Amino acid sequence: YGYYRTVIFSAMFGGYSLYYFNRKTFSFVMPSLVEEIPLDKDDLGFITSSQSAAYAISKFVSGVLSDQMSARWLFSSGLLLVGLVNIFFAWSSTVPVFAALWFLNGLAQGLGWPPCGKVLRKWFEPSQFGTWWAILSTSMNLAGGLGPILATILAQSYSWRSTLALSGALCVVVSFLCLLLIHNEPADVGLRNLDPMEESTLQELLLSPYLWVLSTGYLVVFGVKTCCTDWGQFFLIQEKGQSALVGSSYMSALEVGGLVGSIAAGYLSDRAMAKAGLSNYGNPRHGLLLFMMAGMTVSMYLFRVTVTSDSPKLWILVLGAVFGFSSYGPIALFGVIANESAPPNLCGTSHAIVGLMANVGGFLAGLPFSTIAKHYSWSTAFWVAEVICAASTAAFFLLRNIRTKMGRVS
Numbered sequence: 001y002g003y004y005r006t007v008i009f010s011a012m013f014g015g016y017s018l019y020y021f022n023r024k025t026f027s028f029v030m031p032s033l034v035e036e037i038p039l040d041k042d043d044l045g046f047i048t049s050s051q052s053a054a055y056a057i058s059k060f061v062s063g064v065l066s067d068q069m070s071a072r073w074l075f076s077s078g079l080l081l082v083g084l085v086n087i088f089f090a091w092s093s094t095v096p097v098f099a100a101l102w103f104l105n106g107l108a109q110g111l112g113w114p115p116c117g118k119v120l121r122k123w124f125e126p127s128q129f130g131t132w133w134a135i136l137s138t139s140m141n142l143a144g145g146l147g148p149i150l151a152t153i154l155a156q157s158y159s160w161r162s163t164l165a166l167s168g169a170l171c172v173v174v175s176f177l178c179l180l181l182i183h184n185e186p187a188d189v190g191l192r193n194l195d196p197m198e199e200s201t202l203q204e205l206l207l208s209p210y211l212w213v214l215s216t217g218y219l220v221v222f223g224v225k226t227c228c229t230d231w232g233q234f235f236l237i238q239e240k241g242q243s244a245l246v247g248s249s250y251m252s253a254l255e256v257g258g259l260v261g262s263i264a265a266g267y268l269s270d271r272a273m274a275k276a277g278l279s280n281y282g283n284p285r286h287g288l289l290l291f292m293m294a295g296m297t298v299s300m301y302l303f304r305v306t307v308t309s310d311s312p313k314l315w316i317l318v319l320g321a322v323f324g325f326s327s328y329g330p331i332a333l334f335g336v337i338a339n340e341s342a343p344p345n346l347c348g349t350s351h352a353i354v355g356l357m358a359n360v361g362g363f364l365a366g367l368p369f370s371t372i373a374k375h376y377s378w379s380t381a382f383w384v385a386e387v388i389c390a391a392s393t394a395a396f397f398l399l400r401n402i403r404t405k406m407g408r409v410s
């Protein structure tokens with residue numbers, strides 16, 4: 001019975017890794033193109049913006065669609081389309097064709113997660129859902145970590161035209177293999193399907209306060225994380241008077257702390273869920289959620305106040321790691337909670353809505369924050385961000401007891 005789980009999880013891991021690698025291959029192979037074709041910065045910004053917009057639309061559309069359609073076919077079709085786009089990218093010469101192909105790639109990138117989430121929910125009991133979710137989500141981290149080395153090594157021996165086509169062909173072959181391997185439901189194999197604890201309707205799903213509470217929480221958390229990640233180096237350089245290498249080390253520490261935080265949050269949340277009992281109200285992951293948001297606020301306060309022009313690098317690295325931990329925990333916890341608590345027949349819609357709120361929150365922490373910083377100072381902007389985070393965490397603590405199982409009310 002575990003052999004099927006092992007095979008399915010390995011197939012999903014490989015598929016998602018190839019997804020992310022061929023999403024980032026363009027930035028990986030930037031040089032050979034820039035010294036092959038005289039491209040300007042505006043054109044590259046245009047291409048990246050087109051891909052980002054296509055992916056942002058395709059995430060919501062793919063979630064809503066995968067709420068209904070099968071998982072194996074959708075996953076394989078997405079991977080095949082991405083591979084074909086990467087193949088066609090190797091013969092392109094003019095910028096408009098580059099932009100059109102990359103927009104198509106961004107559209108096809110949306111069919112990556114929702115099938116994996118649906119299969120993971122259908123095949124795994126709730127006591128391991130969060131742990132295996134985090135383990136699967138580390139695949140994109142691995143691909144990003146091991147991309148540039150391979151890209152540079154291959155470019156040192158061959159041009160990009162021989163680099164993108166090979167990856168596209170690999171995508172096609174792996175897509176066919178994953179179509180062969182992945183099984184959507186245990187009953188298809190011929191086993192005993194899991195029994196969950198009157199189909200729900202979107203009308204009676206949208207009228208649940210817990211969904212809006214979760215959406216607001218994710219908006220706030222994602223906005224704060226994006227703001228800190230964007231402007232930490234500038235805050236450390238312009239006023240604190242440090243060096244650039246300190247900023248680079250602080251970024252690396254934040255990334256490592258974030259990875260560790262995501263994995264630890266998943267593991268501890270799964271352990272607490274398994275140990276605790278069953279009830280309609282509340283959710284066992286709320287304790288870890290609130291603890292990590294408290295870590296958010298405390299780390300922000302200490303970084304804003306204590307760090308001065310005469311502080312050792314060790315303090316800065318420790319603060320960065322702690323903030324990364326406490327900021328990459330709740331981001332995964334919101335996704336796990338949003339997928340799990342939803343009724344089985346509407347698992348993707350909640351995740352899609354939460355992601356759209358995440359997009360709005362990520363927008364909110366862009367130009368307005370820079371405007372505020374350039375108006376008064378950087379410290380004032382970080383102070384208002386900290387106040388927002390503290391108010392949000394207090395409000396979320398007050399509403400820990402509201403009904404969680406959204407959908408049909410009996």
Ligand SMILES: O=P(O)(O)OC[C@H]1O[C@@H](O)[C@H](O)[C@@H](O)[C@@H]1O
Pocket residue numbers: 059113137331332333334335336351355
């Ligand atoms: O593409 P999506 O829908 O945003 O999924 C990716 C991320 O979505 C978040 O909701 C999850 O918490 C993360 O674990 C996951 O990595």
